[PDB]
Structure 1
């Protein structure tokens, strides 16, 4: 059934699984028209499909042309997400296909179940975890490839860089969710923390800076403080 705190280590077992987050598929800016009405302008979006064990990210870029002349875009976006995830699964060799797909929002369950009828053995699950994957577009290199796209495109990343050489998947996912939670709560502070020391760079082939094990402990502590800092500023505590 649902994925939660109780069955959390299941994420890092050897059954292939993917998280799917549709938050950033349909993105708009809201603006005034010359006549003083309101209108939206879509901007490019993305499906965030992540293997939490390996770090493999299948970033399907959603170009604004897919919305042209369509109605009820917020509903269409869930179905387009499910269409693209189903297409991804069908594109993978059988031994790479997931056993389970965990959607971060329950409104994705029926769209994905219907698109995956051909795969009755792939379990479609919700989660009670509040995961911060919406903040994916705060990772500069991901945001850059989405905004520069002129057509539909799939781009493959490892969201853990080379961390798995040194830490376990469980620890890597914990670091990722802490980083993303901070970027989501205070993007400016979070990005300040990540770049404050110019001697630490992001490799061309990486998303995050090349911190030593010791420097990651400092960074991780600074991110926790931020989440608590913002939490006080927010609630006055």
Structure 2
């Protein structure tokens, strides 16, 4: 059944699971035509598929060519998402395949269920949480690789950097969700907080700055305040 506040530590047990967020799969800009009508122009998108225990992110980049000549794109986007997730699972060795896939939007349930009929022992679950994974395109390196892509491409990341060397998965996920909630509520503020101090750098192989333990507590403290102020 649904994942919610109450069954939250289940994310960090030893059953392999993946979150799937489809928010950023189909992305458009809306503009005026010469005749004064409105049209859309698609831009590259991505499926955000995340192991919350390990931090492994399977970022399938959705190139705008996949929409060429297609109708009802918002509906197609959900089925394309489910096709790509199913292909990902099939590409993994059996012992690496997830036992559960949690979709962040309920409209992904039927598309994913139908695509995973071959995998009856993989539970497809919704969630009651309002998770902030849409803000993943506010992470500069992720946005950069999506916009530069010239063809369909899968890019692998660890969205926790090296945090698991020092903190537990539960704490890592809480930090991630806090950073993303902040970036979603006020991206400019949030980003100022993270890069204010020029002496703290982002390693080439990382997404976030190399904060010490103490600096992370400071960072996490203004971000929780940026969120309170906006609300």
Is TM > 0.5 for Structure 1 vs Structure 2? yes
The equivalent of 1:125 in structure 2 is 125
Deviation at 1:75, TM superposition (A): 0.1
Deviation at 1:229, TM superposition (A): 1.0
The answer on 1:228 being equivalent to 2:228 is yes
Deviation at 1:203, TM superposition (A): 0.2
Partners in 1 of 2:128 and 2:170 — Cα distance? 18
Partners in 2 of 1:191 and 1:171 — Cα distance? 21
Deviation track 1:43-91 (CA, whole Å, cap 9, x = no partner) reads 0000000000000000000000000000000000000000000000000
TM-score (norm 2): 0.99
Deviation at 1:31, TM superposition (A): 0.2
TM superposition outliers: structure 1 runs of 4+ over 4 Å: none
Partners in 1 of 2:211 and 2:147 — Cα distance? 27
The equivalent of 1:176 in structure 2 is 176
Residue 6 of structure 1 aligns to a residue whose secondary structure is helix
Deviation track 1:141-195 (CA, whole Å, cap 9, x = no partner) reads 0000000000000000000000000000000000000000000000000000000
- How is 1:25-104 mapped onto 2 (pairs within 5 angstroms)? 25-104=25-104
- Structure 1: unaligned runs, 5 residues or longer: 231-237
Partners in 1 of 2:117 and 2:123 — Cα distance? 11
Partners in 2 of 1:173 and 1:80 — Cα distance? 27
Deviation track 1:86-129 (CA, whole Å, cap 9, x = no partner) reads 00000000000000000000000000000000000000000000
Deviation at 1:35, TM superposition (A): 0.1
Residue 101 of structure 1 aligns to a residue whose secondary structure is strand
TM-score (norm 1): 0.97
- What value does the CA root-mean-square deviation take over the aligned residues? 0.2
